[PDB]
């Protein structure tokens, strides 16, 4: 398991809890020095079990496959919360057997079906340590259109963060002031999938991408992505979606 303590957080026990996260999610082999996640995991071991603690001690353990990194729900005391799709129906088999009563979500854990139950989009949701105080504490006790917003900070504070050295970076800057995402964190989430898949077919051509990703850069800028010695790929991402999953 990994925990998190927002009650004493700095910008450096927030960056140790999201290397701490990234070492949890179990990898055969690097491609381009970046963890590969496998391919798939049978059983209650797909599942790594994230224990928040909001400012004033209060707590939510978040089940995470470790394959994509994907959110499947929580247990909030003895209620526990399932997105409504199958790999989140599958997971509630095997975690928080224990709860009283199992609530699914009137939504999938989709950021596109995620936006619209919040009824906001990403680009307007500010986020940040504060926003992941204000989200546990929101997903304490049910409120549906609520938890879609805390679930975006959630997925973006946590998830986002283990994937991109860029976007643990931008929430260590928002550690004691929430700020909506930068141009680059959406584009770097909206790219996971398909930088992954360039990286590793980039092994079999040379470090060159076969199809090149556009990205935003930290300026702001739009930037072609076209083989493994961009800083991208040298110094941002952190883990890679198997091919086998795309
Ligand atoms: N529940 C959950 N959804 C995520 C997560 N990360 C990204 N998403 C979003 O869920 C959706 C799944 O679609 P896809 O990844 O295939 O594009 C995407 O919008 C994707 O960016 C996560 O870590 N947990
Ligand atoms: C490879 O990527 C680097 C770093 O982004 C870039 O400077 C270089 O021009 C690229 N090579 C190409 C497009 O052949």
Redesign the pocket.
């Known amino acids: 398991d990994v925990s998190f303590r927002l009650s004493g957080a700095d910008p450096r026990s927030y960056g140790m809890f999201i290397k701490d996260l990234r070492n949890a999610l179990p990898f055969r082999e690097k491609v381009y020095n970046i963890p590969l996640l496998l391919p798939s995991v049978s059983g209650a071991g797909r599942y790594l079990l994230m224990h928040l603690f909001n400012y004033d001690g209060k707590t939510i353990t978040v089940a995470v496959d470790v394959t994509n990194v994907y959110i499947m729900g929580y247990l909030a005391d003895t209620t526990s919360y399932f997105f409504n799709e199958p790999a989140a129906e599958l997971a509630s088999q095997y975690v928080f057997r224990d709860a009283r009563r199992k609530i699914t979500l009137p939504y999938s854990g989709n950021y596109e079906r995620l936006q619209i139950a919040a009824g906001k989009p990403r680009e307007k949701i500010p986020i940040g340590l504060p926003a992941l105080d204000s989200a546990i504490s929101t997903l304490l006790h049910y409120d549906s259109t609520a938890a879609a917003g805390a679930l975006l900070v959630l997925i973006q504070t946590t998830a986002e963060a283990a994937r991109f050295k860029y976007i643990e970076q931008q929430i260590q800057e928002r550690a004691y002031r929430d700020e909506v995402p930068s141009l680059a964190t959406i584009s770097l989430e909206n790219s996971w999938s398909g930088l992954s898949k360039q990286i590793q077919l980039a092994q079999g051509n040379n ?2 991408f076969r199809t ?1 990703i556009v990205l935003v850069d930290n300026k702001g800028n739009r ?10 790929v040298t110094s941002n991402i952190q883990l890679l979606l198997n091919t086998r999953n795309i």
């Open positions: 470090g060159i090149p930037v072609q992505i076209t083989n493994v010695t961009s800083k991208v």
